[PDB]
């Protein structure tokens, strides 16, 4: 049949420019085998597409923006927070190959991590390590791309690749497909099996060309373009107006600006649907980005615990890392929950536990500790 020959790479920092020096970008950049320096010698992967994504920050948290390769990035000052992104790769993402690389070794030429312990702890590593400053990176990347736990060579019918190309052509301009149009394009080749269409959309999403979620619940948008629909969330998630903690009523045009008011309220609905903020009232917005301890403290657990705004709240009392609650139920109770990123802990002042469990339920074998 016809193979796909495509893959995506998310750079996971805590560096990113250093690995951009091997490219010669605000994520989502495309490269071919000649583009990568040090890996163009191998004609084995001459016709292979590479997709590079990368981010970084403290409150920036986009878990969902196999079928990829994750090069984790480390620096000597950030080694204390190392379990975080590794557990993030283990939980979210997929079963993708992981390449851990330590950068800026010139400032401390004597520091090496215990790569054996983390390699045995994380079975997606398999001793793909580098200790270079600003190459074995090309060898590790090649040995990671061609893996059964990843999709680079996958045999699918050519009609599938025609449908994928047509979907890309439609999505690069429309930026959001309708379910009716999705079915129309799928049946252009006659394919209408829910399983077949689901697998086609999964291979289109996990490769990061056209995104598709199971929690949109919106009839206006079925699939969506990462080149705009993710950068849109990036702009509103931080614009120095959400830093204070509250976004204006409808001043998203001041934030952003191909983007208009129709797209403005499209993305408004999208961001309420992703369970990231709550619209409160009169155009108010939260953007929230006993002793319970979590390894790999999820970045968005306070944004999900602060959705209950028409519930216990004293008065506009939020730390952007915490909040204050005032029970409106029987009797009177005053509560406050606040987070500590440096300790990966959550505090409770005195339903709250029920909401915390309902939020952490969206994790796969996430270890928790109570005290």
């Amino acid at each position: 049949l016809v193979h796909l020959q495509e893959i995506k790479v998310h750079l996971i920092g805590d560096g990113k420019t250093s690995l951009l020096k091997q490219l010669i970008g605000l994520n989502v950049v495309t490269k071919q085998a000649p583009n990568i320096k040090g890996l163009e010698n191998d004609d084995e992967l001459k016709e292979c597409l590479f997709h590079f994504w990368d981010f970084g920050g403290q409150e920036i948290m986009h878990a969902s923006h196999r079928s990829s390769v994750y090069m984790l990035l480390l620096d000597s000052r950030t080694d204390s927070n190392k379990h975080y992104w590794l557990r993030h790769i283990e939980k979210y993402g997929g079963k993708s190959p992981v390449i851990v690389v330590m950068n800026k070794i010139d400032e401390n030429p004597s520091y090496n991590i215990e790569q054996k312990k983390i390699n045995e702890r994380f079975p997606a590593i398999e001793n793909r390590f580098h200790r270079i400053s600003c190459e074995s990176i090309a060898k590790s990347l090649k040995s990671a791309v061609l893996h059964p736990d990843s999709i680079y060579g996958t045999p699918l019918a050519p009609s599938w690749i025609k449908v994928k190309e047509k979907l890309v052509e439609a999505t690069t301009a429309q930026r959001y497909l309708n379910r009716t149009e999705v079915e129309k394009i799928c049946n252009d080749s006659g394919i209408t099996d829910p399983g077949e269409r689901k697998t086609l959309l999964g291979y289109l999403n996990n490769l990061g060309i056209v995104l598709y979620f199971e929690a949109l619940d919106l009839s206006e948008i079925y699939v969506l373009d990462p080149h705009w629909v993710t950068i849109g969330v990036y702009r509103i998630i931080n614009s120095s107006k959400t830093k204070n903690g509250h976004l204006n009523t409808s001043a998203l045009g001041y934030i952003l600006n191909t983007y208009t008011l129709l797209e403005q309220r499209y993305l408004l609905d999208i961001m309420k649907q992703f369970e990231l903020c709550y619209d409160e009232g009169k155009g108010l917005f939260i953007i929230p980005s006993f002793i319970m301890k979590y390894d790999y403290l999820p970045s968005t657990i306070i944004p999900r615990l602060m959705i209950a705004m028409q519930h216990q709240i004293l008065d506009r009392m939020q730390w952007r890392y915490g909040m204050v609650l005032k029970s409106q139920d029987h009797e009177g109770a005053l509560a406050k929950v606040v987070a500590e990123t440096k300790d990966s802990t959550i505090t409770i002042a005195i339903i709250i536990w029920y909401e915390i469990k309902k939020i952490n339920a969206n994790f796969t074998n996430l270890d928790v500790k109570e005290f």
Epitope: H3, Q5, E44, L45, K46, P148, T154, P155, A157
Partner: nanobody
């Protein structure tokens, strides 16, 4: 001899090729056909190219399209790793990395 070199060549002529992946399997004492190294090479291209256990360097795998052959290079051979190698061909075109689809056993 122990820790030596041994290049094994396995040739296939006039078959599916494009709808075929070549995998080497070592099992002397009825070891249930353990997977060693497979390759879905298509001309100069190569898709699967994965190993197991002994991994790369120890065992090298290559494919040449000049005579349609697959070469397994044995280096640093550990004496207890004594097994007989068989060639297996996979033909299914639905789902990459198909171990159970290695139905057409070789010579």
């Amino acid at each position: 001899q122990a820790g030596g070199s041994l290049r094994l060549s396995c040739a296939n002529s006039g078959l599916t090729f494009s709808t075929y992946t070549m995998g080497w399997f070592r099992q002397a004492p009825g070891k249930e056909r353990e997977f060693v190294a497979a390759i879905r090479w298509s001309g100069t291209s190569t898709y699967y190219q994965d190993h197991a256990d002994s991994v790369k360097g120890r065992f090298t795998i290559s494919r040449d399209n000049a005579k349609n052959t697959v070469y397994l290079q044995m280096n640093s051979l550990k004496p207890e790793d004594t097994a007989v190698y068989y060639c297996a061909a996979s033909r299914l075109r639905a789902g990459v990395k198909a171990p159970s689809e290695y139905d057409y056993w070789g010579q």
